[PDB]
Amino acid sequence: SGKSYPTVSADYQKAVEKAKKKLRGFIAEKRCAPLMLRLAAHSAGTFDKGTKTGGPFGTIKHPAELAHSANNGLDIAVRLLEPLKAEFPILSYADFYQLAGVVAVEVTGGPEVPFHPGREDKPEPPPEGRLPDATKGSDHLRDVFGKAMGLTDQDIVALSGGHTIGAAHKERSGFEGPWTSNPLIFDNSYFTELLSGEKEGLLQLPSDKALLSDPVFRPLVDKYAADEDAFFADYAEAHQKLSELGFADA
Template structure:
């Protein structure tokens, strides 16, 4: 939710979250609310998402970039038919490094190329709906039957400086996730400096998120305790 001046998550919002947390704790202290709390917990569990469907790292995001109706000029994106010097020319211009080039190329682990859009056809990995380090594993295998390898993919193992990152990411998926998240954030924020108001509001959002997380944990424990007490009380009455 936002306004013309930025997100509305501020200190007042955080205070409201804290008040709601205290009210909730007072509510669940009453055993009479046990049945409804159990049902609420059941429905709440249905919204749980352990991870994104595709997997992969969590990437920090700061809002505030403006949309534009004007497209950038042609030729500023990498040409898939080119080699190492071309990749460096494009990415170095943006202030990115060899590590960024290799890490961002790992994004090919998702999706596939289509002839009507790029002139190439096929997926880079056996499971193009899963974000993992299989792109680098396949690169080191050489030519893989049925899998796509563009000239800009092959050069990552042919160039010594690129290859050391390919080998690292092929054996250490956590390192790939960490570096990809960092490089993705750098790339997505090129030319963008968030305003002080945006940073302050986003900081309040993080505080609110932590408050909600604490509330959720307290809520879950309290529901379990109340449920046990309710069941024990019901059994006692039935046995009586």
Template sequence: MVEFETALREDIKTFLSEVPCHPLLVRLAWHDAGTYNHEDKTGGANASIRFEPEILHGANAGLKKAVDFLEPFHAKYPAVSYADLYQLASVVAIEAAGGPVIPFKFGRIDSEACTNDGRLPDATKRMPHLRDVFYRMGLSDKDIVVLSGAHCLGAAHKDRSGFVGAWTTKPLVFDNEYYKNVINGDTKGLLLLDSDKALCDEPELEKLVTTYAEDEGAFFADYIESHIKLSELGFPA
């Protein structure tokens, strides 16, 4: 543990208690890391999302607010890289929302090299597209199902994604309700995108969804593993 980690975590938790933006911080970390290409080693968790043109990509609409939220933390703890700060804030937000405690390592290096647009998942598409995106990152079908579970937090906004609504009845609580709703299908008042429905397109995927819907502990255990993989994409060797 670096010397300032405990203090930084507590500061982020205090901020979240005053400004409950847990989903936004998770989305920032995801969108920064999710640009990774394991073949050419470009993108990844390197904080390039804070620069134009990447922050202006359509998939990143609304995330400038998250970048601005975390700026004072970087000013207070200048020894932490932006890349580490974005990923740590996500981990703290998940824990503060009732989710699992996710181990964290510092050492990510900031970059100004923005990636091309189009590397993040398209919510209107199903498994072939999701596999293209996640396999490019070096992730698996299981990671697709597990990481989709983070949709338990937050809601879609018309001015950001074009969609409106929350995936669950408690959008500030990290739990396994998302999977129950995926199994139940379209439910009045709740959001279910094509990329969510895709998790039941194949028997093996649906089996995982069912497991997580029935066993929150199994979801949390697997989520820890997949989240670490995501948050360390492009991590220095």
């Protein structure tokens, strides 16, 4: 909503479609879906609505942005995609990385997140420090997702569910381990685990836990744990919005 998507040529659209297929095979084979989803979200999550700066505009490939502490390990993601990107010179890096995130959700069994091409690659990375801090709580989440990005409380909880795939690594964030028993399967297990309490072998970040105690976030955790279809619907909505921050009249 509020979006006017740009026209791209037929050749551009053809390349999107071909790149989508190549990304499915590559991501599935390399077992890197969680890392690609992180790459897409960290690219998008820097958007500040008040200044219209940052966002999903290809800047995460910049050595300067990769160097941000919140981006530890994403240099691997960028390197992994470079040979594929080279097969699609017509596409912006901006579009390619968001497409990789959409594909990451799909190949792990998640919802089909709508994708619209046309993001332009911007020259300057945003300032460091805009991405969410895992050690903080509900006020912080609203500052970053709501005040900066312009997303809703519903979008915050749904997007937190992205942790249903993947794991933290002690050499990247310092945190360690998967949120779920099935880290390459996209489902509502993140919320199920968040509710059941701490289980050995599984991770919960303070930021994950903050969902449980917030008056608005908690009913959403409950809904998603009870209804995976509702989670998938809200997740697809939220991911689309995230992937489109600052893009197509924002």
